[PDB]
Design a protein around this ligand. Structure first.
Ligand SMILES: [Fe+3]
Ligand SMILES: [Fe+3]
Ligand SMILES: [Fe+3]
Ligand SMILES: [Fe+3]
Ligand SMILES: [Fe+3]
Ligand SMILES: [Fe+3]
Ligand SMILES: [Fe+3]
Ligand SMILES: [Fe+3]
Ligand SMILES: [Fe+3]
Ligand SMILES: [Fe+3]
Ligand SMILES: [Fe+3]
Ligand SMILES: [Fe+3]
Ligand SMILES: [Fe+3]
Ligand SMILES: [Fe+3]
Lengths: 163, 163, 164, 163, 164, 163, 164
C-alpha cells in the first residue's frame, strides 16, 4: 500500500526521531559535567519522548504492511562551549524536524495518500508544542544570562508566589 | 514563525470571536426585555463559548511567538423587531464565522502552514456544530410562529413524554 | 424603575469593565513576549475577574427591567516599553475604575436610588482589594528593579522559608 | 437609643410586613377558587417570606431596647375580578413596601442613625429581588393573556427543552 | 489614598480598640478577686474580640498603603466598688466606641470616601450587637440586685427548664 | 501569698510582654510599607506569641489571689531607617526581656518563693528559643546585605534543594 | 551569651556523653564474646541513648551561638574479667556522669545562668533513671551469682507468671 517515495520518507523520519533521542541523551550527559542537573534531567526525559515519536512512526509503517527501517544513527561527541550554544542547537534541531514533517505532510497531500496525511497530523501538532517548549527555554536562557534579565525573573517569581 | 498574512487573519478571527461574544450578550439582554428568559439564557451561555473560541486562538498565536491582538469590538445596540429577526441574525453571523474560518484554512493550506491548518480543524468541526444548533433553532422558531406548526410540536412533545 | 442618568452610568461601567478585561488580556499577551510568564498568567486570570464584574452589572441592569448595553470596546496595541510602565498603566486604570464607581455611588445617593447604592457596595469593596493588589505589585516591581531591593526580597524570602 | 421618629416608622414597617403576609394568604385562598393551584402555592409560600421580614424588624427593634408593636392588620375580602388584577395589586403593594423602606432609609441617613441605616440594607436588597419577582410574574401573565404571547412562550419552552 | 483626616481617625480607632481589650482584661482580673468567675471569663473572652476589631482596622489601614499606628494605651488600675459600677463603665465605654465609629462613618460620607464608608459598616453592625450585649447584661445585674428581681429570674429559669 | 516585691515584678513583666506585642505589631506595620511581607507576617504572628506570654503571667498572678495589673503601654511611632535597624531593636528588646526574667527568677530564689521560681522556668526556656530565633534572623539579614553573603546563601539553598 | 566557664563544661559533657556511647558499644562487643546476647543488646541500645544525650547538649550549645566541640574520645580495649566487673564499671561510669551534671548545674546556679540551669534539669532527671537502671542491673547480677539468689529469682519469676 505505501508508495516508495512516502515509505522512504517515513523511514527517514523514524531514523531522525531515533537520532533526536540520542542527541538529547548526549546533551544530557554534557549538561551533567556543567552541574546543570535539572536541564540534564529535562533532556533525559525528552529523549524518552523522541523514542515514543519514533515508535509511533515505526508502528504505522509496519501496520501498513511495509518494513520499517531504523538505519544508521550517528551522534557527534559534545562540541558545546556553553549551555546557550546547546539550547540553540536543540531549537534548530527541532526546527529541522518540523521541516521534515512538513515536507512529509506536503508529499502525502500531493500523492493523495490521505491515510498518511491524517496520521501525520499528530506530529504537526506535537511539533508546535516542541518548538514552543524549546524556543521558550532558549529565550529564558538568554535573558537569565544578563543581570537585567535575572532581575525581571526575580519579579516574575515574586508574582508566582504572591498572586 | 507565523507569516504576516496568516497572523493578520488569526488576529482578525480573535477579534471576530470577541465580537460574537459581545453580540450574543447583547442579544441576551434584548431577549430578557421580551420575557424570553430561556432563549436569553441560551445566548448568555453561548457568549461564554465564543470567549473560549477567542482564547484558544489567542493562545495559539502567543505560543507561536507572535503577539495576539484583540483590536476594536463594536456592538450595535439592539435593532431587532422580533425574536425571529434576531435568530436570523445569529444564524447569518455564524455563517460568516464559518466563512472566515474556511478562508483561514484555505490560506494556511495555500502557504503550506500545516501547523495552522491542523490547529484550525477544531474550528471547522466546531462551526459544523454551531450551524446545526443555530439553523435548527431558527427553523423551530419559524414553525412555532404558525398554528399548524404549534400543533406539530404538540405531537412531538407527546412522543417525548409517552415514548 | 432606573433613572436615565443612573442607567447611562451603569451601562458606561459595563463597558468600562469589558474594556478592562480586554486591556488585561492584551497586557498578558505582551508580557509573554518578554518571557514574564507568571505575570502574564496573573493578567490573564484577572481578565476573567473583570468579566465577572461586567456580568454582575449587566445582570443587575437587566433585572431592574432596563436594557444593558455593551457598547464599543477599543483596545490599543501594546505600547509598553517595560513591565514597570505596564504595571503603572494597570494601577492607574484601576484608580480610574474606582473613580467611576465612586461617581456612580455618589449619584445613586444624590438621587436617593438606595437600591443601586447598596448593589454598588460590592464594587466599592472590590476596588479596595484591586487597588491593594495592583499598587502592591507595582511597588514590588520598583523595588526589585534595584540591587538594594533584590537584597531586601532575598531576606524576606529567607524569612518565608526559615520562620513563617 | 432609637429616636421616636425612627421607632414609629420601624413599627409601621413591622405592621406593613404583617399585613403583606395576610394579604398574600388571602390571595392564595382566592386563587384556589379559580383552580390556579401553583400560583396559590406561590402566594402561600411568599406569605411565609413576609413573616420572616416582619420578625427580623421586630427583633431589631427589641434588641435596641425599644418595644416592637404589631398594631392592627386589616385584610379586605377578595375583590379581584381576574388573576391579572390580583397580580397588579401584588406588584403595587410591593412597590409601596419599597417606598416605605426607602423613606425609612432616607430618614435614618438624615438623622445620622447609621445603625438603622445599615440594618435596612438587607431590606433594600430584598425589595429589589421582590420587585423583580412580582413585575416579572405580572408581565408574563399579560403576555400569556394574548395569543401572540402564548406563541412566544411556546418557542421559549422549546428552547428550554432543546438547549 | 487615605486622606489625613480619615487616617488620623482610623488610627485613633485602632488605639481605642486596643484600649478596650486592655480595659476588659483589667476588668476580668478585678472580677476574679470578687469570685465572679463567669463574668471574669466573659470579659477575658471579650478582650479577644476587641483585639480582632483592632486588627481588622489595622489591616485595612495598611492595605490602603498608609501606616497604622498603635499609639499609647493607658489602663487605669481597678477603681470599681461593685460589679454594677464595672458593668456601667463597660456599657458607657461601648457607647463611646459607637460614637467614635459613627463620627468616623459620618466623616467618610462627608469626604465621599465610600471605600472607608463601606469598610466601616461591619463595625456599625458589630456595635449594635455590642450595645445589646452590654446593656442587657447591665439590666440583668440591676434586676438581680433586688429581691423582687431575683424572684422574676427564678420564674424565668423555671420556664427555661419546664417549657423552652 | 505573693510578696509585694515579687508581685510588683510580675506585674512589671505582664506590662513588658504587653508592650512587646504592641511593639511587634508596630514593626509589622512598618515592614509592610517596605514590601517586606513575610517579615511583616512573622512579626504579626509573633505579637500573638507575646500576648500569650502576657496572659500566662496574668493568670498566674490572679491564681495566687493577687490582682494582675496591665498598666500603661506606650509604643513609639516607627523610627526605623532599615530592616536591619528594626531587627537589631527586636533582638535587643528580647535581650532585655531575658534580663528581666532572670532578675525575676533570681529574686524568687532569694526570697525562697519556689512556686514563682518554678512557674518562671517556662519563660527561661522560652527566652532561649526567642534569643535563638531573633539573633539568627539578624545574623542572616546582615549576611544577605552583602554580595559575598548572598553567594553563601545561594549555595546553602542549593544544598536544601539537592540534598 | 554563654560564659567561657559554662561553655567549657558543656563541651566537656558533650565529649563525656560521646565517650559513654563508645564505651557501651565496646562493652556490647565484649559481652557477645561471652554469649551474653541480651546484655550485649541492652548495651548496644543504650549506646544510642548516650548519643541522644550528646546531641541534645551539642544543639543547645550551638543554639546559644557558641561552637560545640566533640574533642578526643578514647575507648580502652576490653579489660573486663567478668560480667560483674563490667557492670560495676558501667554503674561507676554513670555515677561519674551524674557528678559531672551536678557540677554543671551547680555552676550554672552560681553564675546565675538560669537558662543553662533549666536546660540541664532534663539531664538531672535522666541520670536518676540511669542510676536506677544500672544499679538495679548490677544488684541482680550479684544476687544471681549465688545459689541462694537464683532461688529468690525463681520465686520472683513464679510470681510474675502466677499473679502479676
Ligand atoms: Fe520528535
Ligand atoms: Fe522533538
Ligand atoms: Fe465561534
Ligand atoms: Fe460561534
Ligand atoms: Fe473591575
Ligand atoms: Fe478591576
Ligand atoms: Fe417584605
Ligand atoms: Fe415583599
Ligand atoms: Fe470593638
Ligand atoms: Fe466593643
Ligand atoms: Fe515574651
Ligand atoms: Fe519574646
Ligand atoms: Fe548520658
Ligand atoms: Fe548515661
Amino acid at each position: 500500500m505505501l508508495s516508495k517515495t512516502i515509505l522512504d520518507k517515513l523511514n527517514h523520519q523514524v531514523n531522525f526521531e531515533a537520532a533526536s533521542a540520542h542527541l538529547y541523551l548526549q546533551m544530557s550527559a554534557w549538561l551533567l559535567t556543567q552541574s546543570l542537573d535539572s536541564t540534564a534531567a529535562f533532556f533525559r526525559a525528552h529523549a524518552e519522548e523522541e523514542k515514543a515519536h519514533m515508535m509511533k512512526l515505526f508502528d504505522y509503517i509496519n501496520e501498513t504492511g511495509s518494513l520499517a527501517l531504523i538505519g544508521e544513527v550517528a551522534t557527534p561527541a559534545p562540541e558545546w562551549k556553553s549551555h546557550i550554544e546547546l539550547l540553540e542547537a536543540a531549537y534548530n534541531h527541532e526546527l529541522a524536524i518540523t521541516q521534515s514533517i512538513n515536507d512529509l505532510v506536503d508529499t502525502a497531500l500531493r500523492e493523495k495518500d490521505y491515510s498518511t496525511f491524517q496520521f501525520l497530523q499528530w506530529y504537526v501538532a506535537e511539533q508546535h508544542e516542541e518548538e514552543y517548549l524549546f524556543s521558550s527555554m532558549l529565550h529564558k536562557a538568554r535573558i537569565i544570562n544578563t543581570m537585567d534579565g535575572r532581575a525581571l525573573f526575580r519579579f516574575d517569581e515574586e508574582v508566582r508566589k504572591s498572586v
